[PDB]
Amino acid sequence: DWGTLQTILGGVNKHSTSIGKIWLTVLFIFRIMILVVAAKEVWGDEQADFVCNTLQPGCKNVCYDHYFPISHIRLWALQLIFVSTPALLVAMHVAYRRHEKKRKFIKGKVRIEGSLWWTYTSSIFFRVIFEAAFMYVFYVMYDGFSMQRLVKCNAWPCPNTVDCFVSRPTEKTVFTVFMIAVSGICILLNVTELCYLLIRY
Amino acid sequence: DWGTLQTILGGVNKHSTSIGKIWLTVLFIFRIMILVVAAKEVWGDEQADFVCNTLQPGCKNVCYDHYFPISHIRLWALQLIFVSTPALLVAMHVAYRRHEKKRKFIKGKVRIEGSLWWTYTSSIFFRVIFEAAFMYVFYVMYDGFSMQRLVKCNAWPCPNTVDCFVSRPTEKTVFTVFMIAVSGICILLNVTELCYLLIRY
Amino acid sequence: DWGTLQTILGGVNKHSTSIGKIWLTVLFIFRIMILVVAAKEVWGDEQADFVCNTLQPGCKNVCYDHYFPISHIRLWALQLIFVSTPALLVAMHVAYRRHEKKRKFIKGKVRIEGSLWWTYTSSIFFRVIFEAAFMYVFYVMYDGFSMQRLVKCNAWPCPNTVDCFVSRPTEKTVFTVFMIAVSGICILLNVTELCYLLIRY
Amino acid sequence: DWGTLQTILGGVNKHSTSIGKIWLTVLFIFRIMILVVAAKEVWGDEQADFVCNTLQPGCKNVCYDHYFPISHIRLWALQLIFVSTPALLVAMHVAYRRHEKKRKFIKGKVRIEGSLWWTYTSSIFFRVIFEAAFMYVFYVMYDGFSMQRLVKCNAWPCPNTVDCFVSRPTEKTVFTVFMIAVSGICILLNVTELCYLLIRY
Amino acid sequence: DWGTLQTILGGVNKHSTSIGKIWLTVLFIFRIMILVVAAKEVWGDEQADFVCNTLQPGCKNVCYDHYFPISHIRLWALQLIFVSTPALLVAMHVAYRRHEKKRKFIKGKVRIEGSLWWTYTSSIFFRVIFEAAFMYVFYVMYDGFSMQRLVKCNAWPCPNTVDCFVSRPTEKTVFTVFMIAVSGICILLNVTELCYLLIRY
Amino acid sequence: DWGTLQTILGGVNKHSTSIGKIWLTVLFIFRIMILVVAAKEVWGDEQADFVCNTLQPGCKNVCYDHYFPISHIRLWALQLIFVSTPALLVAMHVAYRRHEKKRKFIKGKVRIEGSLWWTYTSSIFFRVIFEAAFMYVFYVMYDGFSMQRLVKCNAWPCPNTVDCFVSRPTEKTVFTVFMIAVSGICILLNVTELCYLLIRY
């Protein structure tokens, strides 16, 4: 049930007029499409075919870890999770509060634009707080903006400084580009909607 | 059918007014999202790439076991199962008792707030009894609050004291943080709802 | 379609008033949840990482087999299958006979409580006959109530008496406890319903 | 869509009164349940952990093949497929011919019991022709009624007579029993329905 | 969504009266059933357990390729895809053109039997053009009508003429029979329908 | 939910009359069918069975990467993703703008052919911009139009010039043909629709 249902409440009836309402969510889908291709495909090799030229037992495991703490496809994953949360927390805040107020005062809209158009504004703030919280780590945590073919790993139980090699560090980067590019694009659309709610207050 | 259906009875029609009703369940989903990422991804290596530097047959298997009795992702799993149980036992207690009493005295609400708002109170008690029963083990069972890069394992059939090394013990811990953090957060929301039912009695 | 459809007919409209009607089925689900975690996760290693300290070809294969004839997770599986059968054979006996008698004498309830409340009584008998038929094997077949870290295996083509070692025999036992505990609990609820049909006849 | 849909047309509205109408199909499900447990679980090892004690290249591959031509779980599979065919060919012959004749002579039941109750009789004949066509092979093709722990394989490129060993040949047999037992039971119910159509003609 | 939806437009409302209309599609299903058993099961070994008795690096990879260019289960796959295309292109040509003409001249059947019963005739031609285009390759491409236990492979980087051995080449052939037999049967039904449209013109 | 839902909005109600409207989308499906066969099947081996004849640690990993930067099945994937985007962005632009304008001026078609028939024209431009943006890379990036049996790889940490060998480079090419052929065909249908919107303006 991954993707189709998040839109049943995420693609709500009639919220705003900016042409960036759907655009942002079409990417949200696109961006989980590109990741549901990367993950199962290019990262399985991450640990397997990660070769350290040393016979020294501890080394290779320690050399992956010291170098790949939260692997990229689990970061990319967490991104799509956190930045998914505001989207579905709001849609949840709506289908609840709207269903509630309605069926309670029917037997016995200033608060529909009040309560909900307000949490949605702070959501949009949350979206770009997350989309940028990770975009940050993904750039600070991981030794520049990509990954090298080999790394020189000083992991504890290696003898002195040893070599190791990653698997397809280009295909791995390629997908770090797209996912980082679309991570920026999806930042601007998010900030444009936080901008439009700062223009008319 | 995992997740979408638990909400069909779990996201009940109209129970209470605390803003922590949905919040708790949005996490419940989030928390099964983070775990349905961890499991199949970072724990496959647990046993495979767990390296003991010894030639001594028995050792490595014994060194995983003596050290990883109920692996983390099956604990995390059990958590989400037990803490899932009160949620769906109540929702089950409702859709049954409500469907029953209704279609039986229609041909031939003091007990709807009696029977059900009462078992729900003891449920909320159960939720935090489990969320904290495991949160306990997960902290007492597993040698501090995380896992080291290497362990010194005295498993029987090793010669004296041998080394062994885990796979991505940081990525493994990273996910033990989030899942332990969200395990605490989901404790408070649970205890706030047990608090609100202790305030007005 | 596993689990959600068994309830569409299993959790029928309005059968009895004992609070153990749903309780038993909530476990039935719980118990297929715990097993759909165990299986694919902890038992893959059963054969793989089962190490016999011998160079003697035949041995390891023979030592698994002579020692793990019907592995636990396929027993647990068979349990949930057989004890699933009465539940869905009755629900099948109902939605058929009820749909039949109805649409045949409408154009041209002593037998609804006769035929069906009677096969259901023998079902409850069947449930506890199976839940206890396996609970039996699972306790008699498998060398006490758990599994050791190593076994001393005399499988034919090993030289004399050799050692072998299992994988995570604790995590494996842990899940033999829960599944054997819940196998007992689900016995009592079954026998309480066979008791209530022995009380009022 | 495997299982739930075959019953939408396979469990038709109102065909006959023998108590073996559903019984046979409840097994049909049961029997695909037991096999959807066996297959992915116990047979993966078939080739992998099949060990021939020889260094002679050709041998092991030839020794599996000469000995496991159509492996059991693909036979079991074929059975459930062929014996599935009459069931769904008839159900297909009905929902077509019944939908056809109806909506064609409404604008502009002697042939409903004629055409369909007749192909259904030959179906029941087909079912037991298949259920017994394989039951036959499964007993004649495979060296008695089970499998040994080791086989002495004379496959071409082995040096003279070599040993080889299978994986869990008991667990493998256990599941050959159940599936062969239920293959007999499902023969009798099929022949009882061919008997009841031979009694009243 | 593989199989169930192809019939929603494929199992059309009311096209012709030949008893080979459903028969052909019941096989189409059967034939994707047999292949969705073969593939994931018997061909995984194709490359893995393909053993060439040589130490010569290049060899084994080259000996699979030069000998298994488009492996059988990807041919079988392509067949079911191409021969699936006319079936769903027509069903697509209908549900479009029929929905179009109808809702356009309702506000403001000589072309329903014209346009559609005509492309359907050329479809049936296409079906047997594909079913026989592959049936051809599958017989011409692959060294006779089956596969041997061993092949003598002259792949470039082998030293002179080397041996190699396949995995379960009988189980592999067995499934090449059925799928080639049903590939012939599904040719005749296709040609019988092209015959019936050549009889009455 | 992959494929069936893209059509619910992709294959909209009633857009144009060219016989290339469905044809293009029938391929779009066909083309994701051929790829959902290739990927999981023929590319798993890409890295695994990629053999470099050298003992030199770094080499093999570097020799795959320097030679397979974004592997084919992830390109093919990205293609079907990008060229999928205009299709679903438009269908998204419609079901939103059409649902919006309608339910807003009903209580209180020059812009339906204006706004939407115009973005759809630029979509068709986008489709062929992507379909040809990759078709380009797929031909320029990858050393001619196919792949050789062996490559001579000069990857850094190899000693001088080493050999390596790919897996099934023919089966891999075969599927590069179809997917490149259908990548051209799906270019023309796209350009014919951009042509028909250039003919009548």
From Swiss-Prot, chains A, B, C, D, E, F:
Changing V83L: In DFNB1A; sorted to the plasma membrane normally and forms gap junctions that were morphologically and electrically indistinguishable from those of control; the mutation reduces the permeability of GJB2 gap junction channels to inositol 1,4,5-trisphosphate (Ins(1,4,5)P3), resulting in blockade of the Ins(1,4,5)P3-induced inward calcium current in neighboring cells. Changing W43S: In DFNA3A; does not affect protein trafficking; affects the ability to form functional channels; dominant negative effect. Residues 13-19, 94-119 are cytoplasmic. Keywords: Calcium, Cell junction, Cell membrane, Deafness, Disease variant, Disulfide bond, Ectodermal dysplasia, Gap junction, Hearing, Ichthyosis, Membrane, Metal-binding, Non-syndromic deafness, Palmoplantar keratoderma, Transmembrane, Transmembrane helix. InterPro entries: Connexin, Connexin26, Connexin_CCC, Connexin_CS, Connexin_N, Connexin_N_sf. Changing D45E: In DFNA3A; the mutant is targeted to the plasma membrane but fails to transfer ionic calcium or propidium iodide intercellularly suggesting disruption of both ionic and biochemical coupling; heterozygous gap junctions also show dysfunctional intercellular couplings and hemichannel opening confirming the dominant-negative nature of the mutation. Residues 1-12 dip into the membrane without crossing it. It is found in: Cell membrane; Cell junction, Gap junction. It is linked to Deafness, autosomal recessive, 1A: A form of non-syndromic sensorineural hearing loss. Sensorineural deafness results from damage to the neural receptors of the inner ear, the nerve pathways to the brain, or the area of the brain that receives sound information. Deafness, autosomal dominant, 3A: A form of non-syndromic sensorineural hearing loss. Sensorineural deafness results from damage to the neural receptors of the inner ear, the nerve pathways to the brain, or the area of the brain that receives sound information. A hemichannel or connexon is composed of a hexamer of connexins. A functional gap junction is formed by the apposition of two hemichannels. Interacts with CNST. Forms heteromeric channels with GJB4. This is Gap junction beta-2 protein.
